[PDB]
Amino acid sequence: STFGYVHGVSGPVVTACDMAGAAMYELVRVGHSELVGEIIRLEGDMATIQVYEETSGVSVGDPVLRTGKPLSVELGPGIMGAIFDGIQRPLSDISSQTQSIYIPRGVNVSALSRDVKWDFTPCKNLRVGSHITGGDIYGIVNENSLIKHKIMLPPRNRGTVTYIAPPGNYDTSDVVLELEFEGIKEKFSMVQVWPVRQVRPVTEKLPANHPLLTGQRVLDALFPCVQGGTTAIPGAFGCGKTVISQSLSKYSNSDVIIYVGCGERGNEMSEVLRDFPELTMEVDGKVESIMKRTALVANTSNMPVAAREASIYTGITLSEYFRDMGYHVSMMADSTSRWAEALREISGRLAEMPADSGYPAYLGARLASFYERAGRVKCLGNPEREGSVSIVGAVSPPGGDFSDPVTSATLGIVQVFWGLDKKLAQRKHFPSVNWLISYSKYMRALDEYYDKHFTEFVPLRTKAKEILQEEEDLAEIVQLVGKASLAETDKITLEVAKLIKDDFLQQNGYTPYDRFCPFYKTVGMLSNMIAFYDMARRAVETTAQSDNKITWSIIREHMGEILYKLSSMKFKDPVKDGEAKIKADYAQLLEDMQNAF
Amino acid sequence: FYRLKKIQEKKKILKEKSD
Amino acid sequence: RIEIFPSRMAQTIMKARLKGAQTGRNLLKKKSDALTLRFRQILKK
Amino acid sequence: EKKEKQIEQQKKIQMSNLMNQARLKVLRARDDLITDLLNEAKQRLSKVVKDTTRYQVLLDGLVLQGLYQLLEPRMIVRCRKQDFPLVKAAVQKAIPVYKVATKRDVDVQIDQEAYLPEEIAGGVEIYNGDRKIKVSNTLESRLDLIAQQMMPEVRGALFGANANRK
Amino acid sequence: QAAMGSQGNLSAEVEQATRRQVQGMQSSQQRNRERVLAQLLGMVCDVRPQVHPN
Amino acid sequence: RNYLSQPRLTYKTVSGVNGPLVILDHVKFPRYAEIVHLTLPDGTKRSGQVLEVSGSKAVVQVFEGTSGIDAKKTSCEFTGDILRTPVSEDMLGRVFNGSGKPIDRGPVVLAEDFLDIMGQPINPQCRIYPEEMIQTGISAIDGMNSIARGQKIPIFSAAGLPHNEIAAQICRQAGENFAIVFAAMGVNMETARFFKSDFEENGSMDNVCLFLNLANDPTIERIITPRLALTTAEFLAYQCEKHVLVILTDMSSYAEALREVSAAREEVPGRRGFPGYMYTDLATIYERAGRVEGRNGSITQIPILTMPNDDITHPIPDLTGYITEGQIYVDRQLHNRQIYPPINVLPSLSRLMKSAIGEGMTRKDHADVSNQLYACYAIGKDVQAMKAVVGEEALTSDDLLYLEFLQKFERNFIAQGPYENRTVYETLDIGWQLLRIFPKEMLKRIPQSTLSEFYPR
Amino acid sequence: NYLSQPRLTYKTVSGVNGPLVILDHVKFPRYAEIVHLTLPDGTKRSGQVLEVSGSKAVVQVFEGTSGIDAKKTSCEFTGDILRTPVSEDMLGRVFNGSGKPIDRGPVVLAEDFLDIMGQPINPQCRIYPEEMIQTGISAIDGMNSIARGQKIPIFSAAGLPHNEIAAQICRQAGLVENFAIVFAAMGVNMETARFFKSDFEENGSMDNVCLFLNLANDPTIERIITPRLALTTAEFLAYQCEKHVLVILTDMSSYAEALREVSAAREEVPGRRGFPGYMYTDLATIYERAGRVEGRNGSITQIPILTMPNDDITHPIPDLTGYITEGQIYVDRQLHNRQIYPPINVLPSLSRLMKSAIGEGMTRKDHADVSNQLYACYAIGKDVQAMKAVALTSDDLLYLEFLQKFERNFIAQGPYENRTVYETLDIGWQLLRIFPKEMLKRIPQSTLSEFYPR
Ligand SMILES: Nc1ncnc2c1ncn2[C@@H]1O[C@H](COP(=O)(O)OP(=O)(O)O)[C@@H](O)[C@H]1O
Ligand SMILES: [Mg+2]
């Protein structure tokens, strides 16, 4: 056969008769307008096809032509800075072509521009007749000033070079490489086609050792994440699950950034592409905007529900491809709970039996096959480069309830879990990461990095997590039996933990001094507030009974100027770098002398 | 009540396939 | 604030926890009322 | 204590990887004694293909085994190009044997449009009339059936038996 | 001095314990190679077509 | 020019009627969402979408209910197109019923264009972000939770609360180029008359497109009521470039009309009986908002939903909390104290507060004082939680001011009265007075560079 | 007893959904067969047979149905049950989910072919577990010590360090010299696979471990045939090669979750919370393959780790496990928040074979009474601690001195300390030293006399 015929439509799914030689997960095009669909089930002569666009007006007598290929992206230059939908069609070309403000629901816009020309240069001793394998760099293309899009071979094939293009400007459809095999001399180009449901082959995985500097104070200190790690950000509506995701895409220590909007708002992707081209960052003393390193996969809630499956798998396929260049890729999935609602709506039409709360039984296998594609890993190919993929997947639980089959299947896979709280957003405590229920399992793996650069921070967080731990048990005390009967070793605990909750954990992301703090500033103000609790420990412990001693109202009325240096320590904007370490020891020296005074 | 009613409909469709 | 896992046998446990705390207040209410009555007539004395 | 503890631990990792590849070299050197044995056996099936008075009494039953296990009204035998006159005498011997055991009549034509490739040692591939169900009774497939079920026997009767058993 | 003791263990087992185990099974394979070959080839020639529950 | 001229077939071959679904037979090439025109045996005309097809069958669902539909005599009369509403600029001043028809003895509309009621999603590359701040006058909405022209934001209320009394207020005093499309789904007779006779007062009826659908109207018509209310407003904006304000009454009552039709389809219940796609079908009627690049027009949504049993964890305020760009919470304890807009500011956030304020837009201390007026509100709310336990005398001098602000915050910063609008400059100059009953150095959210000017006055 | 008829090859699939492939026109199909799906791309996938009906047979492929056509695929029927190639050489190597090697090695040379379902033991000729295994953990050997041959899970929750106390009872696994650990990893990450693969080569213990692994990358149907194929090599080494094994299945909850996907795709009538009805029996055939026979010298003990969803012991995965196994080890969340390693809660954890593995002959005379008394002051201490937050007796502060000293000094022991049982009871007696002689009710005076003053 070469095409099919629709037999019945019901929402997103499409049953198509006269379709025998079609495999599972093919890419067919149903309708007179050729809506792009994928086969998800077939029973004998018919196939059941989910459709990545809105089925409306699709009749029974419509043709369904099949292509014999899975859902695949086009990987090559022209992919950074642009904005795509779930099936990788560029949203900037699709409005400069049709001149409208809508997506015309039938257009086959090429995923990469076959008209713009990039300056190619070969990989500098790639000789003719040299042996070449699958996945090594045979040329460099400078897409922007920041990113050198290293052209690679597909991982399937390999051979001996017969022709390489001379250094110059080429299209994305020009033949650049021809390789001889046993049978056939095979042509190539600058683009490659890879199926999004198949994991990219790679040499051997490596342990993760370098941390992901997100810039937040509570995130980098208590629950750190490494590049090559998996992270989940749950929390109810209005908690700020995306302002941590937009703080990751602006100020991370990552080479490229790929932001995936899966069932997101339409204004939240327009918020991204507006304020990014004025945020210039430096790498080698040169400033350029972060839109050179950010690629948006935009699939809003208005856009159809079967395409939410594709926008997650596309954005991790671009993230796996840029990993093969050696770049330390990051990925912000936003949000995977709207992806799991696409699995429920599709399986509802197929009469599948549900698991707990509506979702299908394979929900734990789709999330595991997506989160486990992250991790720093020595790539394929001869130039011997080590890349990474770090997945930060936002989760939107309904009603703020973490006993949910999306979240409970997520936490068995992710290592870091930044549990946001809804009570911490009524009081304007931003970021709202609940420091009790949140955890990270990167800590034992990260102190080896800490015993090289910042050699005092592991005993710091052990006491910083402890003072927040003892505050929670004593908060239930003072709300029942009152604060009047409290001890003096515990009333100092209730103040410095309240001093942590407005200095350290609170962080106004829109001011010039707390929109991104480095790690020396974060370890700086924590090395003082813990030393303040350690010094005020001795003021009660050693002179406990004998002398008419410090009852700490002595301290709170006399040391108010040093506490004002602590309560305003966070105000060091990035115009001072070496001064902040001096002021950290200067405000310590004000704290050093007053135990004698 | 959704899982048991799904089987009640699938016990009828399998019945009329036999008839 | 939710305490434990729902949907079987925690309802009967919480109905035991509520019933003890319901009359536990009323027992302590009569204690605080008889103490105040002891406090009221000791004021006039 | 960071200078002596690492060099004993890296001694242990070096001793672990060397002991593991001491096991992985002798186990890979156990295959090449088995793989050439299946290769030397694959040579000696082709000598059985040569002598026709042994090859046709073999192909008398090797077609008979395909007809009995398939049990179709209409079957189709596929063979090599050279054995086309040989299996034609074999199938006509096998017709009034099939009618003795199974009462069902049968028909067994031998196709002309399709032949087995030349790299096959011998044997037939008998199909049904619908070209769906296939019984591959070639000599490259009949050997691998017996090679797997004899893997306990071709270890104990070809290496030393284990000293720790029942 | 541990590094010459550790490389002294390398030149004490990969060349005698690995090599005599390959050679020690090479000799036992060669004495019994022909008995199991007639056992295998005697089993590719046994054809008995039984046909089961009708 | 482009049209279809083939005559429509008329089937008399219905086969299965179970609930609101009429299964047809011997249909020749049925499309997915055609409108069919049922003709009842007693001369009644009913309409209906096609729900799903399979081969020769076509399972339609009737809008006006299924009571009276025969098996032999009824004549379902197909139409080879999708539901196209008749839309025009002269639908501005007329009161329409649920589906599409006029109420106030007027004629059917002449409709220079026919638009799909499902619409098309706007390209997010050419969807510009709302920056122009609109003025409502209510100090809880204007000053503390400022909304921009193009922002979608609901009003969280319950039964008995005056949501419809303050929604007509922001419909009255919002700020010659301002249009209003109103959709009433599941209202009473009084509320449909209270909204009809409120726009009869201010002379705003020359820019009002009231879509009434009362409680006696059929329950499937409540599905297509906020669809037609938006594609009307997607024609007064985005094609004629005027600023439309869409107000959807009882978005709660739309969703029980979405739960009821899905239980008839017997498919995939989510939380509390609501269907599995209840996030999507509240998003296709919420994401028709915002401004685009090549148009001067705009469309801003203020839906109203009554959360059942005052629970914000109910799926009706929950799923709209994730898809809109904020919320406005109306409190019941403040309504019991005769506070006028009985709004509480703690769970009511506006997401576009960070862009609509500034030195370019409005008075740079406004963006920062709202961070502080939440802090004095949130700390003081725990003080009344503490005052219930220990006693009114065990409070210290710090947390007596947190009660002193909180009593003065409700009656002075809120309760403007039902006919008084006050601008953002009047909001801050009555809002800075509430922070001047506080002392210095406890306003920790305010930096010292901005606190130095406004505190001495 | 070998089969020799040539295998049929069906090109007649007629339906595929999820992990299932439905065949037609099959001539005499057999239940629980093994097949070989040959893809049009030339890929080879295997599969069991879940249900035959006349000429139909619905197979479940292991490597997923992605790519399977309706006309070009060919499914070859092996005429027997899935029988794994087991050998003594399956020790010291690393295998994937079903049966393939990982460390670039050979396929195993098949000393014997054994059924992966096993065969049921005679309950009459099964000797009782008496010899006590010393795990080194004070929270185990002090309170709920495990005997050799005893099946006993570790009830964890998601996020808790159960893998570091899984490897802790590998290095400190010994009696009070051929302790061949058989490991089975189901649904683990790569960073948890590196924590198990590179912690058996660190101690040099990789000469006796048979680490299986089934990562989250690998398909979910292979998780079903992992503990049936990891036990039947452990059943070979312990009953046919007279070696003491210890099998540590990992993440039993994930093994169940793979059982739910096949059950939901089969459209069977389900049980509690979506799991199939037969999960009690399906978790019994991979749990009851433990203990030791009376005719041989070997033994097989089982420590199957499982995480409970949302910290719920009433979930069907820890509920049916506590009805098949012989008591649990409940590593808790709240003890992990107080930074305890191991964070084992000693109140719901239990061992039904601690009563017959302790005493004067086995370990020492005071094991039976210090384990009841440390349990007694911990259980009585908890409800008075709840009344403490919301006094009243000077002996109540004695019980809260027990709670402060129990969690810090007894159960907390660090990641590399191996307390012997002779060292464990001395630290347990020091905790009872803060209580008087009269308040230890459940210790008789004959055992309280010589042990309390020291
Ligand atoms: N660290 C922060 N800095 C500035 N604003 C914040 C911060 N955290 C939360 N917010 C505010 O909280 C609200 C949450 O925005 P949003 O992320 O859209 O909610 P949600 O997480 O449900 O998507 C916004 O008004 C945002 O400005
Ligand atoms: Mg969000």
A and B interact (at least 3 Cβ pairs within 8 A): yes
Angle between helices F163-172 and F189-196 (to 10 degrees): 20
Report the DSSP pairing between strands G56-61 and F243-249: unpaired
Q: Give φ, ψ of A285 to 5 degrees.
A: 80, 0
- The answer to whether D44 faces chain E, any CB pair under 8 Å, is yes
F440 touches chain A (CB under 8 A): no
Among D117, D119, D137, residue whose Cα is nearest residue D127: D137
The sign one gets for the Cα dihedral G258, G260, G262, G265 is negative
Q: How many CB atoms lie within 10 A of CB A530?
A: 20
Distance CA D82, CA A523 (A): 83
Whole-angstrom CA distances from D110 to A244, D115, D122, G9 are 72, 10, 16, 19
Q: Is A157 helix (H, G, I), strand (E, B) or coil?
A: coil
Hey, whose CA ends up nearest to atom 24 of ligand 1? F351
Q: What does the alpha-carbon distance between residue F318 and residue D87 come to, in Å, rounded to a whole number?
A: 76
Helix (H) or strand (E) holding G236: helix G227-239
Instruction: Identify the bridge partners of residue A160 per DSSP, sorted by sequence position.
Output: A131, A180
F269 vs B2: CB contact, 8 Å cut-off? yes
Residues A449, A431: Cα–Cα separation, whole Å: 26
Give me the DSSP letters along A286-322: -EEEGGGSEEEEEEESSS-STHHHHHHHHHHHHHHHH
Q: Which residues in chain D have Cβ-Cβ distances shorter than 8 Å to E22?
A: 25-26, 29
For ligand 1, mutation pick of A243, A264, A424, A510 (most atoms within 8 Å of CB): A243
Burial class (CB in 10 A: 0-12, 13-18, 19+), A36: buried
DSSP H helix total and E strand total for chain C: 1, 0
Exposed / middle / buried, residue A575 (Cβ in 10 Å: 0-12, 13-18, 19+): exposed
DSSP code of residue A199 = P
What's the sign of the alpha-carbon dihedral F291, F296, F297, F298? Answer: positive
Strand order in the sheet with A159-164: A131-132, A159-164, A177-180, A186-187
Per the structure, the count of domains in chain F is 1
Nearest Cα of chain C lies from the Cα of G312 at a distance, in angstroms, of 7
Of chain C, the end-to-end C-alpha distance in Å amounts to 47
Instruction: Yes or no: say if F44 and F10 are a contact pair by the CB < 8 Å rule.
Output: no
- Residue A381 backbone class (left: φ over 0; alpha: ψ -120 to 50; beta: rest): left
The Å distance, Cα A376 to ligand 1 centre, comes to 30
The rounded Å distance from CA A240 to ligand 1 centre is 4
Q: How far apart are CA G220 and CA A369, in angstroms?
A: 10
Q: What gap in Å lies between CA F226 and CA G1, rounded to an integer?
A: 74
* Alpha helices, H only, chain E: 2-10, 17-31, 35-44
Q: Which two tokens stand for residue A338?
A: 């709207």
H or E element, residue G378: helix G367-389
Residue G268 tokens read as 């069977």
Asked if A87 contacts A36 with a C-beta cutoff of 8 angstroms, the reply is yes
Helix-, strand-, coil-residue percentages of chain C, each rounded to 5: 80, 0, 20
Overall size of chain C counted in residues: 45
The SS3 assignment for A472 reads helix
Nearest in space to F20 (alpha carbons), one of F330, F328, F257, F368: F257
DSSP state of G410: I
Q: At what angle do helices F424-435 and F366-387 cross, to 10 degrees?
A: 50
- Out of F345, F351, F352, mutate this one to test ligand 1's pocket (max ligand atoms within 8 Å of CB): namely F351
Find the residue in D nearest to G7 (Cα).
D135
Residue A508 CA, closest ligand 1 atom number:
3
Residue in A296, A285, A298 with CA at minimum distance from that of residue A318: A296
Q: Please give the structure tokens belonging to residue A31.
A: 């309708």
For the stretch G228-231, contacts whose Cβ atoms lie closer than 8 Å and that sit 24 or more positions apart, written own/partner, are G228/G116, G228/G117, G228/G118, G228/G285, G228/G286, G229/G84, G229/G98, G229/G99, G229/G116, G230/G182, G230/G183, G230/G184, G231/G118, G231/G182, G231/G184, G231/G286, G231/G289, G231/G300
Closest approach of G139 to chain C, Cα-based (Å): 25
DSSP state of G249: E
Q: How far is the CA of A509 from the centre of ligand 1 (A)?
A: 9
Q: Are D3 and D123 in contact (CB under 8 A)?
A: no
Strand partners, A485: none
Q: At CA A326, angle to CA A324 and CA A328, rounded to 5?
A: 110
What is the identity of the amino acid at A54? E
Identity of the amino acid at F275: P
- Ligand 1, pocket residues at CB < 6 Å: A 237-243, 430-431, 507-510; F 349, 351, 354
User: Which tokens in the block code for residue G72?
Assistant: 């070009």
List beta partners, residue D69.
Answer: none
Instruction: Using the mean position of ligand 1's atoms as its centre, give its distance from the Cα of residue A422 in Å.
Output: 12
Report the candidate in F296, E45, F451 with the shortest Cα–Cα distance to residue D54: E45
> What's the rounded Cα separation, in Å, for the pair G18 and G68?
11
Q: Are A329 and A387 spatial neighbours (Cβ–Cβ below 8 Å)? A: yes
- Residues A566 and A591: their CA atoms lie apart, in Å, by 10
Question: Residue D128 and residue D115: Cα distance in Å, rounded?
Answer: 16
d(CA G363, CA F5): 97
Cα distances (Å, whole numbers) of residue B4 to B10, C29, G260, G329: 10, 51, 16, 36
Q: How many CB pairs under 8 A join D and G?
A: 100
| Other C-beta atoms lying within 10 Å of the C-beta of residue C35 | 10
Cβ-Cβ contacts under 8 Å, A473 against chain G: 389
Can you list the alpha helix ranges (DSSP code H) found in D1-152? 4-50, 52-70, 84-101, 139-149
Structure tokens at A356: 């707990």
Residue B3 in tokens: 């899982």
Q: Which residues are CB-contacts of A113 (< 8 A; sequence separation ≥ 6)?
A: A78, A90, A93, A172
Question: Residue A295, class by beta-carbon neighbours within 10 Å (0-12 exposed, 13-18 middle, 19+ buried)?
Answer: buried
The rounded distance, in Å, linking the Cα atoms of F4 and F9 is: 14
Two structure tokens written together for G279: 């999960």
Distances (CA, A) of F90 to F181, F230, F397, F438: 13, 16, 63, 55
Give the separation between CA G278 and CA G267, rounded to whole angstroms. Answer: 14
Query: Is A563 within 8 Å of A503 (Cβ atoms)?
Result: no
CA-nearest of A431, A75, A390, A103 to A255 is A390
F396 close contact with A: CB closer than 8 A = no
Place of tokens 């012989």: G326
Whole-angstrom Cα distance, residue D70 to residue F409? 90
Helix axes F366-387, F398-412, angle to 10 degrees: 110
DSSP letter for each residue of A573-596: -TT-SSHHHHHHHHHHHHHHHTTT
Residues A304/A54, Cβ–Cβ less than 8 Å = yes
Question: Do the beta carbons of residue G275 and residue G259 sit within 8 Å?
Answer: yes
Retrieve residue F255's tokens.
Answer: 């969703």
For residue G390, give every residue at least 6 positions away whose Cβ sits within 8 Å of its Cβ, in sequence order, or none: A480, A481
CB of G267 within 8 Å of a chain B CB? The answer is yes
Q: What is the DSSP code string of A84-117?
A: E-TT--BTTHHHHHS-SSB--SS----SS-SSS-
What's the token pair of residue F178? 């301002």
Give strand ranges (E) for A359-408.
377-378, 386-394
Give the C-alpha separation, F285 to F246, whole Å: 11
- On whether any CB of chain G is under 8 Å from the CB of E51, the answer is no
Counting Cα atoms < 13 Å in the Cβ hemisphere of G154 gives 29
Question: Which pair of structure tokens corresponds to residue A483?
Answer: 């604060």
Rounded Cα distance between G37 and G32, Å, is 15
What are the beta bridge partners of residue A17? A5
Element (H, E) at G305: strand G305-308
Q: Which two tokens stand for residue A477?
A: 């005390």
Q: Is the dihedral of CA F107, F113, F119, F124 positive or negative?
A: negative
What's the domain range around F453? 1-457
Q: How many CA atoms lie within 13 A of F422 on its CB side?
A: 20
- Residue F354 CA: which ligand 1 atom is closest? 27
Cα distances (Å, whole numbers) of residue B16 to B3, B11, F26, F267, G51: 20, 9, 20, 21, 21
Residue A316's φ and ψ, nearest 5 degrees, are -90, -15
Residue at token pair 């084992």: G344
Can you tell me whether residue A35 is helix, strand or coil?
A: strand
Report yes or no: G367 and G376 within 8 Å, Cβ to Cβ: no
User: What's the order of all strands across the beta sheet hosting F57-62?
Assistant: F10-11, F76-77, F35-39, F45-54, F57-62, F21-24, F14-18
Of F410, F285, F335, F36, nearest in space to F157 by CA:
F335
Please state, in angstroms and as integers, the Cα–Cα distance from residue A96 to each residue in A91, A101, A530, following that order: 9, 10, 57
Q: What is the 3-state secondary structure (H, E, C) of chain F?
A: CCCCCCCCCEECCEEEEECCEEEECCCCCCCCCEEEEEECCCCCEEEEEEEEEECCEEEEEECCCCCCCCCCCCCEECCCCECEEEECCCCCCCCECCCCCECCCCCCCCCCEEEECCCCCECCCCCCCCCCECCCCCHHHHCCCCCECCCECCEEECCCCCHHHHHHHHHHCCCCCEEEEEEEEEECHHHHHHHHCCCCCCCHHHHECCEEEECCCCCCCCCCHHHHHHHHHHHHCCCCCCEEEEEEECHHHHHHHHHHHHHHHCCCECHHHCECCCCCCCCCCCCCCCCCCCCCCEEEECCEEECHHHCCCCHHHHHHHHHCCECEEECCCCCCCCCCCCECCCCCCEHHHCCCCECCCECCCHHHHHHHHHHHHHHHHHHHHHHCCCCCCCCCCHHHHHHHHHHHHHHHCCCCCCCCCCCHHHHHHHHHHHHCCCCCCCCCCCCHHHHHHHCCC
| Stated resolution in angstroms | 3.8
C10 contacts: CB under 8 Å, gap ≥ 6 = C4
Question: Which of the listed CATH numbers 3.30.2320.30, 3.40.640.10, 3.40.50.970, 3.90.930.12 matches domain D44-153?
Answer: 3.30.2320.30
A 10 A CB-CB count for F327 gives: 22
One-letter identity of residue G328: Q
Contact G186, G227 (CB under 8 A): yes
CA dihedral sign, ordered A479, A480, A484, A490: negative
Whether A370 and A312 have beta carbons less than 8 Å apart is answered as yes
Pair D112, D128: CB distance under 8 Å: no
Cα Rg, chain A, nearest whole Å: 28
Residues on chain E touching G28 (C-beta within 8 angstroms): 52-53
Please choose, from the candidates G111, F417, G145, the residue with its C-alpha nearest in 3D space to the C-alpha of residue D160.
G111
Residue A200: DSSP 8-state: P
What are φ and ψ of residue F321, in 5° steps? -70, -20
- Total number of residues shown for chain B: 19
Chain length of chain D: 166
